[PDB]
Design a protein around this ligand. Structure first.
Ligand SMILES: CC(=O)N[C@@H]1[C@@H](O)[C@H](O)[C@@H](CO)O[C@H]1O
Ligand SMILES: *[C@@H]1O[C@H](CO)[C@@H](O)[C@H](O)[C@H]1NC(C)=O
Ligand SMILES: Nc1ncnc2[nH]cnc12
Length: 261
């Protein structure tokens, strides 16, 4: 397992970009790519996971453990009380959950669970973030950083805080990794909180669809228009990989073959 570390607390677009690239590079199946979009490995990769050690506010860190396969943050750990406090979504269930715990807390002698008392569905996180939508959860490095700060090492944080952080982290890490677009959003908004636009959200929501679409794209043509959202929330009908590709950082693993380039 690898740790892409990203210090959200002190960072730069470029570092974030690098983080993204690292994250993508770490997350992606080295060999899988559809349309030049790296794709996440299946869930049978040697290295299933990836850690994203985010450092945020007060240099507090939260390590996201991302399943490389779908770059899901499976939970995260934060150094808490000398413990690897691992917080795993409660729908990280058994062996992954142990692996997530273990992975999160591999080089920590001590661990303590602070489960994410919720699954990682955005809806969940949003619910838990008590936001209607993570559209409402501003993303931003600072937010992430701060969020990291609100969570990492924090004996208590509400699910809300966590969920927000997760929303933030997930999006700024995984989604951003998944979607260059999102990455780009972050980067574009690097010095600011930003409300993830609909495209972020949409991409996020449609990543698998996109990945699928892209993966299943024949010579660039998405099997089906991907109805995505433009940044401004307008419908964005992607017909072709190339339309969406730029947004894509990672394709969700989609088995079978695709035009790798
Ligand atoms: C197994 C895997 O890689 N699945 C991801 C899933 O987590 C995501 O929710 C969906 C796109 O929205 O794409 C797929
Ligand atoms: C960020 O880190 C750089 C060097 O890595 C340092 O000069 C700067 O003070 C740090 N900024 C903040 C606000 O953490
Ligand atoms: N936990 C998570 N990690 C990455 N992407 C997500 N999308 C929704 N939940 C997620």
């Amino acid at each position: 397992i690898n740790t892409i570390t990203y210090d959200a607390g002190n960072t730069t677009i470029n570092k974030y970009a690098t983080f993204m690239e690292s994250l993508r590079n770490e997350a992606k199946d080295p060999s899988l790519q559809c349309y030049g979009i790296p794709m996440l490995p299946n869930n049978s990769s040697t290295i299933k996971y990836l850690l994203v050690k985010l450092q945020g506010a007060s240099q507090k860190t939260i390590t996201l453990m991302l399943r490389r396969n779908n770059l899901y943050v499976m939970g995260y750990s934060d150094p808490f009380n000398g413990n690897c406090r691992y917080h795993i979504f409660n729908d990280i269930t058994g062996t992954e959950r142990t692996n997530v715990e273990n992975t999160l807390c591999s080089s920590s002698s001590s661990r303590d669970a602070k489960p994410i008392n919720y699954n990682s569905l955005y809806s969940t996180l949003e619910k838990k973030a008590e936001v209607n939508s993570r559209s409402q959860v501003q993303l931003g490095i600072q937010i992430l950083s701060s969020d990291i700060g609100k969570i990492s090492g924090q004996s208590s944080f509400t699910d809300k805080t966590e969920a927000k952080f997760l929303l933030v982290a997930i999006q700024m890490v995984s989604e951003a990794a998944r979607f260059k677009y999102i990455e780009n959003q972050v980067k574009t908004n690097f010095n600011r909180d930003f409300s993830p636009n609909d495209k972020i959200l949409d991409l996020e929501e449609n990543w698998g669809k996109i990945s699928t679409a892209i993966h299943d794209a024949t010579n660039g043509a998405l099997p089906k228009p991907l109805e995505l959202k433009n940044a401004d929330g307008t419908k964005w009908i992607v017909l072709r990989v190339d339309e969406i590709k730029p947004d894509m950082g990672l394709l969700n693993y989609v088995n079978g073959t695709c035009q790798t380039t």
